[PDB]
Amino acid sequence: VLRDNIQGITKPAIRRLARRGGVKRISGLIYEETRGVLKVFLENVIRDAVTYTEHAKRKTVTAMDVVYALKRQGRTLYGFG
């Protein structure tokens, strides 16, 4: 039942991401690749955040764990620190 949301990423959302980055032409099958790259990066992020929160001796994760995962993988977060 709760295992069929891989396509939950919508075509309007993906085309809108495409529009923000500035393209005019897109591939038709690239969409699933985009979703897969999304999924892998999501997974890396969330698992590392779990590593923090567990090492935080905590159950409910915070966005601070999100921040530390973000920097551990190596990117910046603006306005939330």
């Binding site: 085309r15 809108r16 529009r19 032409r25 159950k59 409910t60």
Partner: protein, 176 residues
């Protein structure tokens, strides 16, 4: 004016390269181009725009070799996709992804040496802060000017009283 009118009537430096130049054609499969041009040829003049440019460039088509599209690009350029949207309805009763429910889950799972009225006050303050943040979200970009307070000391009495009261607002509170 009117009366007289009627009376008479009857990497190198950017400054060394010049201004950024841009060109876009709707017809090109070639992407729009923007770059600074510094090539100086006396053959290409406004008087004769179509004159040959010898030893400057080839009069050969590059858009086709730039982008021979021949692919399902979905015509993302315009007229489709921006207006399309979908609504839905959800369930948020099992695992509450909310400020009050999140606070309740956190307090139930994790218990500390804090009074229940204190926990309620903290939750109310955090919710108020989130609501104030949501309200201030409409400020969007706000250009911020730097502020600096000079070395004002209690010895001096001719300094600005505005800065004096500002730093007085930052008092050091001792405890007995």
């Amino acid at each position: 004016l009117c009366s007289q009118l009627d009376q008479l009537l009857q990497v190198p430096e950017r400054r060394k390269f010049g201004r950024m130049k841009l060109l876009q054609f709707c017809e090109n499969h070639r992407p729009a181009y923007w770059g600074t041009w510094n090539k100086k040829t006396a053959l290409i003049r406004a008087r004769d725009p179509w004159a040959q440019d010898t030893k400057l460039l080839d009069y050969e088509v590059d858009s086709d070799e730039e982008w021979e599209e021949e692919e399902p690009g979905e015509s993302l350029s315009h007229s489709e996709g921006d207006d399309d949207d979908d609504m839905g309805e959800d369930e948020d009763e099992d695992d509450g992804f909310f400020v009050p429910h999140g606070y309740l889950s956190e307090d139930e799972g994790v218990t500390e040496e804090c009074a229940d009225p204190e926990n309620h006050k903290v939750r109310q303050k955090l919710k108020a802060k989130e609501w104030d943040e949501f309200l201030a979200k409409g400020k969007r970009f706000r250009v911020l000017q730097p502020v600096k307070i000079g070395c004002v000391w209690a010895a001096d009495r001719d300094c600005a009283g505005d800065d004096l009261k500002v730093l007085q607002q930052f008092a050091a509170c001792f405890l007995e």
